[PDB]
Design a binder for this molecule. Structure first.
Ligand code: ADP
Ligand code: ADP
Ligand code: CA
Ligand code: CA
Ligand code: MG
Ligand code: MG
Lengths: 375, 82, 74, 160, 126, 375, 82
C-alpha cells in the first residue's frame, strides 16, 4: 500500500467487536467488547493497576473484574464505555489515527434513532474522522454471499433480525426483528446447568458458560427423539474441564440450550421461533418473489454456527412451505465474519465512494444528517 | 597442663577437618543449585511446548468434526436427490 | 459535551495564538520590522513542526518496538 | 573502577604481584594454586570486623564468568570493576535506547541476523563464528532470530 | 577467552554506535536547517510601499496562524504518542518487575574503605 | 551512605524480633522477644543487677529469670513490656535514634483494631518517629518471592495465616487465620516428652524444648508408615545433650511434634490442618484464578522450616485438588526472613514513598488514622 | 595452664560451630539434589507428552485435508443434482 486512503470497516456488534481495513478477507482484530473495573481493594503499591481493562485484556484478568457489556440489544446503553471501546479499537488494536480514515459502522434494523445520531456525533466530534457511513447489518451479509436477492437471517449475539431483499430492492415492511440471541441462550444454559449441581453466578463465570455453549451445544434435528434418547442411553454425555479442574458432564443440556431458538417459550418469550419468523417474513412479501426468497435463504451471524442448524431450519421451513417450492439454506463456512466481509466489499466499491457523510455536510445539518438522503 | 595441650591439639585437628568438609559441602551446594535452576527452566520450556501442541490438537479436532458433519449431511442430501 | 467542547477550546486557543495585528500606527520601516518578527516566528514554528515530526517518527519506532516486546510476552 | 585501571594502564600486571606483596603479609602460603580470594578478605576481616562469608563468596564468584573454571587476571579485573560501579549500565539507558534505534534502521522492532552482522562489520571486530553464535544466544535468549530492546539490554547488561 | 578483551570489544562497539549516532544527529540538524531555509518564504524587502506591506503582514499572519494550527495538531499527536509510550513502558515494567528490582545487600563493605582502614594511607588506587 | 534518609524496617513478630535498615538483604539484629525479671533474692551488693533483662541478654541469664513473651498470638497483651522491647531494639541493637527515621511495622491479618491503634500511638508519642506504616505480614512475604500472584501460608510462631492474592488484588473474603503455630508445637513437644521421663516445667526450660524441636524434629512424608517403622527398628532415635549433660534420646517424638500442623486434633483444636485450610482458602476464590493459585503456593515464616514439609504439603494438596491442575510449592531457602526481606523491598520503592502516615496527619485525625486511606 | 585451658575451651566452641555448619550444609546439599532429581524426571515426562501431542496434530492435519477434498467433490455433485 501507499498513497491513497483506505477505509476503516468497523463493526460494533454486541459481544465481539470486529474491525479491519477495507479490502481484506478477515477482520484484523477481533476481541470481546467488555469493560471491567476492578472490584477488590488492591494492596500492592506501584503495580501499575489501571482503572478499567477493556477488550481482550479483561478476558485474562476476569478473575478480579466485573465485566459489563456496553451494548445490550443492538442499542447502546452506556455511552462512556462504548467511547472507551472505540478508542481502544482505533489506537491499540489497529494503531491508526482516525483523523485520516473513513469509517463504516454497522447498525441493526429498527433501532432507536438517538443511538445512531449519538454514534455519528461521537465519530465526528471526539475521534474527528473525515467521513462515516452507517449500514444495516443484513445488507452486508447479503453482499458477502455474492448474491443480489435472498432473505438473510442474521442471528447475532444481541438481536436476531430477518431482512428480505429482492433484486437489490429491500422490503421495509417485511423486516422481522426478534430480540432472542446468543446472550439469552447463554443465560438459559447457565440457568439449566443448575439442574445438575453446577452453579455459575458471577459475571465472570458467564464467560465460562459461554465457552461451554460454544464448544459443546448443538441443535437437534428432531427434538423429541433426542430427548428420548438422552434419557435412556448415555452416548451424549460429553465432559468439559473448568478453568480449575473438576470436570463437568453435560447431558441433555447439550441440545436444550440452542433449542430455545426454535421454541422461544422456553425463556418465556411469546414469539415464534427463528424457523417461523422467516416464513412469516417471506409471506409478507409479494406473491411473485416468494420462490426466489425460498431458494436463497441466507444464514449469517455468530449464533447460526451451531452444528446441525442448517438442516433443522430447512426441515422446519419445508414443513411450513408449499410442497412444490425448493427450500435451500445458504450456510457459508465463514458465517461469523460474513457481515464484516460484506462491509469490506461495500467499502471497496467505486460506486459507493460518494455516499459517505462528509464532515462539511455534518457541520451544515447537524447529527440529524444520518436520517437524510445519506442514509 | 599436659591434658590441656592434648585437648588443644585434637581440637585444632578436628576443627581443620570440619572446615574443609564445610568448604566441600558449600561448593557442592552451589553447583547443584545452578544445575537445578537450569533444569527448572528446561521443564518450563517443555511444559509450554506441550501446551501449545495440545491446543493445536484440540483446534484440529474441532475442525475435523465440523467438516465430517458437513460431509454426512451432503451425502444424505445426494441420496434424496437421486 | 466535551468533544465539541474540545473543538471549541482548540479553535479558541488558536484564536488566542492569533496576534492582534495593527499597522495603522507604524511607518513602513516598522512594518518591515514587524514582518521580520513574524517571519522569525514562522521560522520557529517550522522548526518546532520538524522536531515534532522527527519525534513522532521516533515514537512510532518505539511503539513498534513495544508491540514486538509484547508479542514476545505473548 | 575504571580510574584504577586508567591510572595503572601504563603499568603492567605487576600491581597484582604488588597485591601479593600485601598478601605476603597476610595470606602468604597458598597451597592449591587455584582460585582462592576468600582467604585474603577473611584475614582482613579477622582484624576486628563482624564475620560474614557471603561477601567473600560473592567476590570469589564475581571472577568466574566463562564457566570453564579458569580465572585469568582479566576475570579478576572484571570482578574489581563490577564490584564498585558509579557510571554503570552503559552510562544512561536513554543512550542505550538511542543506539538500539540506530541498530534497527528498518524500524521493525526485531533484530535479525543481517542487522547485527552489519553492525559487527561496521565495528569490524574479529570474532569467531562460534563467538558469533555465543553473542546471538546471549542476546536472543529465546533463540528465534529476533532481538527486542529487552534482549539487547540483557546482552548489553553491564556493558559501557 | 579473556574477559578484559571482551569488555574492550563491547566498549569499542559502544563508541562506534555513539559515533554513528552523532553522525546521524548531524544529518538530522542539516536536514532541519535545509527544511527551514526551504519552507520559510524569504523576506523580499525591496520596493514595497505601505499598503502592500499591510496586505503582506495580514496574509503572513493568517499563514502563521494556519501553520501554528498544523504544528499544534502535530504537537498533540506527539504528546499522545509519548503518553502511550510511557503507559506501555509501565505495562512492560509490570510484566517484567517483581524480582527484577535491584536486590542489593550492604554487608559487602567497599573493599577500598577496608584497604584504606587496614593499610593507613598506602591504598590509594581503590 | 550519607545524606538522605533511610527507613527502619522493624518486624515485631512473636518469638523473634527482626529489624534492620531498608535496602539490605538480611535483618541487622535478630533476637528473641522476651523480658524476664529476676525471681530470686540476690545477696551480692554492687553487682549492678538490673530489674529486667530483655532481648538476647535474657537468653544467657535465663537460669535465674522468669521469661515472659509480651506477644501471645499476634496481638500484644502487655504494652509496657512491648514498649521496653521496642526501646531496646531502637537504641541498643541498631543505635539509631527514632527521631530521624521512618518505621514500617508488620501486623498479622484479622487482628484487633485496638492493638494497631495503640501501636501507632506509641510510635508517634513515645518514640516520636517522623512517619510509620503498618503492613500485613503476608503481602511482604509475597514481595520477597518476586511474584505478583499466589497464596502465601505464613506459619509464624504466634499465628498461622493464609492470604491469597491475585494480580496484586488481595481477596479479603478468603483469608483463613488459624492460631496454631510454633509455640503450640513447643508446648505439645514438652508435653509428649514426659512419656519417656524427661520433665520440663520452668519457663526457662521451654527454651530448651524449643531448641530440641528446632534441631531434631522433622515432618514425616507418611505418618502411619513412620509410626510403624519407629515402633520396630531403632534407626530414628537421635540423641541430644542438655545444657548440663545427661543426654536424652528422642524416639517417635521426632515427627509427632510437627505432625500437629496437619492434624490439629492432637492438641485438641477442632480445625483442619494447614494442608486443608490452604485448599479451603483456594476454593473460596473465584473459579478462574484457582489454577494460578494452585501453581504458585508460597511458604514463609519460621515454622515452615521443618525438614520435609514442602513434600508432605504438596502430597496432601495433590490428594485434595483436581488431578489435572499442577501443584507447586515455593519454598525459598531464606524462608525465615522472607517477611523482612519483602518489607525492605517495599520500603525501598519510590512509588510507596507517599503512603507513609505523616505525623501532621496523625495530629489532625488521631490514632484512628491507620484504618483510613493510609492503611 | 589456666590460660591454655581457656583457649582450649574457645577452640572447642569453634569446633562445635563447625559441626553445626557442616550438618546444615549437608542437609542443604541432599535436599537440593533430591529436588533436582524430581524436576529432571518431570521435565522428561513433559517433553515426551509434547512429542506425542505433535504426532497427534500431524495425523489430525492429514484427516482434515482428506475430508475437505471429499466435501468439495460432493459439493460439485450436489450442484449437478440441482
Ligand atoms: N462456534 C460457535 N458455536 C456456537 N455459538 C457461537 C460460536 N461462535 C460464537 N457463538 C455465539 O455467537 C456470539 C458471537 O456473535 P457475533 O456474530 O460476534 O455477534 P455480533 O453480531 O455482535 O458480532 C457469541 O456470544 C457466542 O454466544
Ligand atoms: N530451623 C528451624 N526448624 C524448625 N523450627 C524453627 C526453625 N527456626 C525457627 N523455628 C520455629 O519458628 C519460630 C520462629 O518463627 P518466626 O518466623 O521468627 O516467627 P515471627 O513470625 O514471630 O517472626 C521459633 O519459635 C521456632 O519454634
Ligand atoms: Ca530491526
Ligand atoms: Ca529473540
Ligand atoms: Mg452481527
Ligand atoms: Mg512472621
Amino acid at each position: 500500500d501507499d498513497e491513497e486512503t483506505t477505509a476503516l470497516v468497523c463493526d460494533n456488534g454486541s459481544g465481539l467487536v470486529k474491525a479491519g481495513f477495507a479490502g481484506d478477507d478477515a477482520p484484523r482484530a477481533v476481541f470481546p467488547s467488555i469493560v471491567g473495573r476492578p472490584r477488590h481493594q488492591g494492596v500492592m503499591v506501584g503495580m501499575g493497576q489501571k482503572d478499567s481493562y477493556v477488550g481482550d485484556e479483561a478476558q485474562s484478568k476476569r478473575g478480579i473484574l466485573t465485566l459489563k457489556y456496553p451494548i445490550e440489544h443492538g442499542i447502546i446503553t452506556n455511552w462512556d464505555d462504548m467511547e472507551k471501546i472505540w478508542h481502544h479499537t482505533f489506537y491499540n488494536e489497529l494503531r491508526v489515527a482516525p483523523e485520516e480514515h473513513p469509517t463504516l459502522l454497522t447498525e441493526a434494523p429498527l433501532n432507536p434513532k438517538a443511538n445512531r445520531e449519538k454514534m455519528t456525533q461521537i465519530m465526528f466530534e471526539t475521534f474527528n474522522v473525515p467521513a462515516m457511513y452507517v449500514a444495516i447489518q443484513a445488507v452486508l451479509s447479503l453482499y458477502a454471499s455474492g448474491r443480489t436477492t435472498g432473505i438473510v437471517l442474521d442471528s447475532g449475539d444481541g438481536v436476531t433480525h430477518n431482512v428480505p431483499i429482492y433484486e437489490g430492492y429491500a422490503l421495509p415492511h417485511a423486516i422481522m426483528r426478534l430480540d432472542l440471541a446468543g446472550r439469552d441462550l447463554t443465560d438459559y444454559l447457565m440457568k439449566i446447568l443448575t439442574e445438575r449441581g453446577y452453579s455459575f453466578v458471577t459475571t465472570a463465570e458467564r464467560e465460562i458458560v459461554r465457552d461451554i455453549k460454544e464448544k459443546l451445544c448443538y441443535v437437534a434435528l428432531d427434538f423429541e427423539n433426542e430427548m428420548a434418547t438422552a434419557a435412556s442411553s448415555s452416548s451424549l454425555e460429553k465432559s468439559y474441564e473448568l478453568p480449575d479442574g473438576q470436570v463437568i458432564t453435560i447431558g441433555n443440556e447439550r441440545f436444550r440450550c440452542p433449542e430455545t431458538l426454535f421454541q422461544p417459550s422456553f425463556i418465556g418469550m411469546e414469539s415464534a421461533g427463528i424457523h417461523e419468523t422467516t416464513y412469516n417474513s417471506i409471506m409478507k412479501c409479494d406473491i411473485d418473489i416468494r420462490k426466489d426468497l425460498y431458494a436463497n435463504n441466507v444464514l449469517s451471524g455468530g449464533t447460526t454456527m451451531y452444528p446441525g442448524i442448517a438442516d433443522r431450519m430447512q426441515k422446519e421451513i419445508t414443513a411450513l412451505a408449499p410442497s412444490t417450492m425448493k427450500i435451500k439454506i445458504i450456510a457459508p463456512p465463514e458465517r461469523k465474519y460474513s457481515v464484516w466481509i460484506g462491509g469490506s466489499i461495500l467499502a471497496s466499491l467505486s460506486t459507493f465512494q460518494q455516499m459517505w457523510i462528509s464532515k462539511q455536510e455534518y457541520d451544515e445539518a447537524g447529527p440529524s444528517i444520518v436520517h437524510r438522503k445519506c442514509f | 597442663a599436659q591434658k590441656d595441650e592434648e585437648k588443644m591439639e585434637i581440637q585444632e585437628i578436628q576443627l581443620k577437618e570440619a572446615k574443609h568438609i564445610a568448604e566441600d559441602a558449600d561448593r557442592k551446594y552451589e553447583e547443584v543449585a545452578r544445575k537445578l535452576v537450569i533444569i527448572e527452566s528446561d521443564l518450563e520450556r517443555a511444559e509450554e511446548r506441550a501446551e501449545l501442541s495440545e491446543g493445536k490438537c484440540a483446534e484440529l479436532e474441532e475442525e475435523l468434526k465440523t467438516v465430517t458433519n458437513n460431509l454426512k449431511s451432503l451425502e444424505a442430501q445426494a441420496e434424496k436427490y437421486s | 459535551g466535551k468533544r465539541q467542547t474540545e473543538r471549541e477550546k482548540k479553535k479558541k486557543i488558536l484564536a488566542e495564538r492569533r496576534k492582534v495585528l495593527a499597522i495603522d500606527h507604524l511607518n513602513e520601516d516598522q512594518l518591515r520590522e514587524k514582518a521580520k518578527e513574524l517571519w522569525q516566528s514562522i521560522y520557529n514554528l517550522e522548526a518546532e513542526k520538524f522536531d515534532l515530526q522527527e519525534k513522532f517518527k521516533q515514537q512510532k519506532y518505539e511503539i513498534n518496538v513495544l508491540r514486538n516486546r509484547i508479542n514476545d510476552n505473548q | 573502577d575504571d580510574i584504577y585501571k586508567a591510572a595503572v594502564e601504563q603499568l603492567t600486571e605487576e600491581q597484582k604481584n604488588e597485591f601479593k606483596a600485601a598478601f605476603d603479609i597476610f595470606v602468604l602460603g597458598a597451597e592449591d594454586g587455584c582460585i582462592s580470594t576468600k582467604e585474603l578478605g577473611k584475614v582482613m576481616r579477622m582484624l576486628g570486623q563482624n564475620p560474614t562469608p557471603e561477601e567473600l563468596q560473592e567476590m570469589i564468584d564475581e571472577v568466574d564468568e566463562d564457566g570453564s573454571g579458569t580465572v585469568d587476571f582479566d576475570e579478576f579485573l572484571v570482578m574489581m570493576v563490577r564490584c564498585m560501579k558509579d557510571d554503570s549500565k552503559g552510562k544512561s539507558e536513554e543512550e542505550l535506547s538511542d543506539l538500539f534505534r540506530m541498530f534497527d534502521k528498518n524500524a521493525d522492532g526485531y533484530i535479525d541476523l543481517e542487522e547485527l552482522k552489519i553492525m559487527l562489520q561496521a565495528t569490524g571486530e574479529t570474532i569467531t563464528e562460534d563467538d558469533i553464535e555465543e553473542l546471538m544466544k546471549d542476546g536472543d535468549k529465546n533463540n528465534d532470530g529476533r532481538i527486542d530492546y529487552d534482549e539487547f539490554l540483557e546482552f548489553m547488561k553491564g556493558v559501557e | 577467552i579473556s574477559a578484559s578483551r571482551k569488555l574492550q570489544l563491547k566498549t569499542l562497539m559502544l563508541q562506534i554506535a555513539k559515533q554513528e549516532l552523532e553522525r546521524e544527529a548531524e544529518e538530522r540538524r542539516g536536514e532541519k536547517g535545509r527544511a527551514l531555509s526551504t519552507r520559510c518564504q524569504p523576506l523580499e524587502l525591496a520596493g514595497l510601499s505601505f499598503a502592500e506591506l499591510q496586505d503582506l503582514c495580514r496574509q503572513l499572519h493568517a499563514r502563521v496562524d494556519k501553520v501554528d494550527e498544523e504544528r499544534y495538531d502535530v504537537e498533540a499527536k506527539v504528546t499522545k504518542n509519548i503518553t502511550e509510550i510511557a503507559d506501555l513502558n509501565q505495562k512492560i515494567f509490570d510484566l517484567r518487575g517483581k524480582f527484577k528490582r535491584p536486590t542489593l545487600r550492604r554487608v559487602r563493605i567497599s573493599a577500598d574503605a577496608m584497604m584504606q582502614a587496614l593499610l593507613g594511607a598506602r591504598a590509594k588506587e581503590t
